[PDB]
RNA sequence: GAUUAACCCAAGUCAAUAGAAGCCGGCGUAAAGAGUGUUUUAGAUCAAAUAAAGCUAAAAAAAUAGACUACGAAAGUGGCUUUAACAUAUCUGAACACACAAUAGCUAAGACCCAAACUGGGAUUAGAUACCCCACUAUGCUUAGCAACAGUUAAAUCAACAAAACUGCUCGCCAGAACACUACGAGCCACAGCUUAAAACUCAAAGGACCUGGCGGUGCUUCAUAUCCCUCUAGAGGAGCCUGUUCUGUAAUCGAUAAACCCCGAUCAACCUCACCACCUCUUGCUCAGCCUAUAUACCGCCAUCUUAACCCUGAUGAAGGCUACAAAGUACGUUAGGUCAAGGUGUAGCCCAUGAGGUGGCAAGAAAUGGGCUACAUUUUCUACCCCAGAAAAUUUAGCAGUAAACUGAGAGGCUUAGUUGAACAGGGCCCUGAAGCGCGUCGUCAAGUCGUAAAGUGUACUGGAAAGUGCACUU
């Protein structure tokens, strides 16, 4: 399968009409070899349906097409790259389906046929997502898709679709952080009670043609058959955010803020005691089972008190 | 590895192992010396502070003085008054004694004007501003808790680099990488994660200071900037023939005349003749015949192409370096599948029932777009007399630069060489490129190495869920 040569940075500057190399405001991975590595780590893609986000110049696109995919849905925001992607599509007829639009609003649930939809408890449904997006867009995207897994909608109408996304090295570590680690944070819990998350490898900044001052991690997500917390996404998000707002103080200092001041002291204690959270646990020392306990007790407290779930302590400190 | 020869020791040789064999050397940068004061058994010779009360002026914390450099052990202290008040008559000596001081990180409560990591909300490109605006947390606040000392500048000062080297006297510290790596395990946790280590082991290094450089490099700056530009000046497209290329067409050549014609120049086809096409004939014949058929892709010739050290000083006699003019170390021929067989040769090959000699017919093209050439092209003209006061007729390109362009005459060897006459127009800006110097920059990556690809700013720490890095707090130049 012969494909067009990859565009060098010269052609890319000419294409974006910048006429210089220090005005891109973007970093491109123009190394087909690292992209081969990433597509290898994404799994066995033979006759797979790949939803590739943030195509850009097309190193990831070329790497994926080199693997024997069936359909490769591309979603590009910029129109200066559609010409190159159209040349790629013509070089490999029938495999590249290009679309123009934002990945944060694009509806993947209708993109692929309904004959690929496997049940949730069965194997991942032969539909993969691969992404090298701006880090300013991959974090909202992963939050949105985590909500989708919690609701079993969106890209996960086909089942437990696997994701391979590039994040910043720190963000990737935090996504794949263990209990007690110095990178354990909100993002770790939020990703980990819904997915098996693996930080596979780190690409140094020197490998990107405009070299960034950061490293880039590649992280693989596989939705879990049995989520570790069976509560609504927004409730878990609220609990985790209030726990982790004070990362270096005891866990109760952050949990007291879920309740109005009037009943802060007694309600916080009731929460902790109907859970079994030792109040000397600092937030990085809480496993997903501690958060499951807190979420269950908090769901109860909300269900016998309607006003609670909408409470925001800063809206009460304003007055 | 074998073999030859050599070397050492020798009734031994020498592989392994183990001993013998070593601190009066150093601690800014290589391993090793500061938070401050007091005391301490011994050893040595060197016998504008601080705390209290009160009080305040401009706008709680203190402009001017302060260009001052004082007080205090250090951290620190600079609004006014008053009261207390600023140890000690030799030095060294604390992990363990007493006082202070600062730096992290958490824990309890408390205040909250203001600011503010995180967290929400609003506005913005066409991955918006990461950056603007609003609100409000942690936090910033307040408590209580977790090398010394004395003398020297004499010497060769002087591994270098810092910060000129020194002695004496005392304490502490230092004897490769290695403040290496590693979780047998332990604690917390409670099946899967976090925190916590020395030693072995391995190696011949590790470490410190300095120097040369090299980029077959990168851009720009100014001017000399002549050729080349650009401007500017003066002429050069229509018509008729002849040539170049293309397409179309034929069996074929609208091809040539030391070989026709013409007898003004030239010329087209000529029934010349050679050349081409289609048919035939001749044969030992011309004369041991006949062809200009090839070759300089044979040489020669003629043109053209390309290539063509020493000495003396400086750095402590280290790598290393050496300039000032009102002068401070510098001086001494080949090459070519080249063209030319027309003003010229010396050879070599070819066919010899044909590459020779004849005969019968045909052949005589068409069409465009463009390239080139030759003629006539006038009123500032043409004809006569005269040699200048008469009468009759009717777009690219080439040069420029001066006796040049343009126009007009003569002489030659027989398209080329020389001698004359008349005689213009324009004449301003900038470059390529060498010349003359100056500044800066600059000193690539990756999957298994290429049979790989390509040309205000910082340092920490904390949080970060719109993180290709941002913000907050404290510091540095
Ligand atoms: Mg023996
Ligand atoms: Mg040291
Ligand atoms: Mg003392
Ligand atoms: Mg505020
Ligand atoms: Mg001492
Ligand atoms: Mg003819
Ligand atoms: Mg003949
Ligand atoms: Mg020749
Ligand atoms: Mg942020
Ligand atoms: Mg910072």
From Swiss-Prot:
Annotated consequence of substituting residue 132 to A: Does not affect SAM-binding, DNA-binding nor transcription activator function
Catalytic activity: adenosine(N)/adenosine(N+1) in rRNA + 4 S-adenosyl-L-methionine = N(6)-dimethyladenosine(N)/N(6)-dimethyladenosine(N+1) in rRNA + 4 S-adenosyl-L-homocysteine + 4 H(+)
Tissue-level expression: Ubiquitously expressed.
Result of altering residue 102 to A: Inhibits rRNA (adenine-N6,N6-)-dimethyltransferase activity
GO BP field: rRNA methylation; rRNA modification; transcription initiation at mitochondrial promoter
InterPro entries hit by this protein: KsgA/Erm (IPR001737), rRNA_Ade_diMease-like_C (IPR023165), rRNA_Ade_Mease_Trfase_CS (IPR020596), rRNA_Ade_methylase_Trfase_N (IPR020598), rRNA_adenine_dimethylase (IPR011530), SAM-dependent_MTases_sf (IPR029063)
Transit peptide segment: 1-18
Family matches, as SUPFAM superfamilies: S-adenosyl-L-methionine-dependent methyltransferases
Effect of residue 77 to A: Inhibits rRNA (adenine-N6,N6-)-dimethyltransferase activity
Phenotypic consequence of residue 247 to E: Abolishes the interaction between 12S helix 45 and TFB1M
First-level EC class: transferase
Intracellular or extracellular location(s): Mitochondrion
Induction record: By the nuclear respiratory factors NRF1 and NRF2/GABPB2 and PGC-1 coactivators.
Gene Ontology cellular-component annotations: mitochondrial matrix; mitochondrial nucleoid; mitochondrion
Effect the entry attributes to changing residue 56 to A: Abolishes methyltransferase activity, DNA-binding and SAM-binding. Does not abolish transcription activator function
Physiological role: Mitochondrial methyltransferase which uses S-adenosyl methionine to dimethylate two highly conserved adjacent adenosine residues (A1583 and A1584) within the loop of helix 45 at the 3-prime end of 12S rRNA, thereby regulating the assembly or stability of the small subunit of the mitochondrial ribosome. Also required for basal transcription of mitochondrial DNA, probably via its interaction with POLRMT and TFAM. Stimulates transcription independently of the methyltransferase activity.
Protein name as annotated: Dimethyladenosine transferase 1, mitochondrial
Organism: Homo sapiens (Human)
Lineage per the UniProt record: Eukaryota, Metazoa, Chordata, Craniata, Vertebrata
Gene behind the chain: TFB1M
